Amino acid sequence: MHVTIEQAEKAIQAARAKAVELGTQMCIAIVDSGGNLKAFHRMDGAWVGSIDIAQKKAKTAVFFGMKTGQIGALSQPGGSLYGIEHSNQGLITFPGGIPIVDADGEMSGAIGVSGSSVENDDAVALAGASAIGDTELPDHPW
Template identity: 80%
Template sequence: MHVSIEQADRAIAAARRKAVELGTQMCIAVVDSGGVLKAFERMDDAWVGSIDIAMKKAKTAVFFGMPTGQIGKLSQPGGPLYGIEHSNDGLITFPGGLPIVDADGVMIGAIGVSGSAVENDHAVAQAGVETLGVWDLPEHPWRT
């Protein structure tokens, strides 16, 4: 099962609203469960370099079924995933990418956000996921 275009559009709209609230410009990518780009938005004045980062954050989150920030903690020198960012044509292992899981607990895609401090990237991605109504599942270990 894949994230629908309607879900992707809603996630991007909610993420954009959060970015505006934070006073920042973002690139926002939504990928389906196979890591293929479903929807994308580059807000006015968002960094061009953030386009690739947002897409790779979304891809990283869906490939491994966890937030990119969590992968980052595991990929530090000496960690069990050290060097993982060099796989899969490049991954991003800092916050801003979150899986999108449906009400049945099935991962249907992911969102990736880039363009600000990683704390803002994560908050904007979280806003995108929360609007789909799946964030409240208690088994999500990445809830903040």
């Protein structure tokens, strides 16, 4: 399965609602299981630099089937994936990207959020992904 545009827009609206509740102005990106952009929403007032980061976060999450901050926990100096961010035209490995997982457990795309603290980004991404699916893959080696 691929994330449909209807699903992507529902997730964007759920994410935007959580952003407004937290008092934030976010960029919200949805990509499909190929990393290709499916939908994008820059809230009024959101940081311009967050446009690229939201899309890179979604890409990173779908490229590896993992929330972005979980990759960053492995890519610190000394870590097993130090330097992974150079790959794939640039990854983002701090929180804000979350895989979207369909009913039969397959990853159909991902959401990426940027524009506030990384903790607020994660909470907004989670609200957006949870409105359309499960958000986690089991048995991940990382």
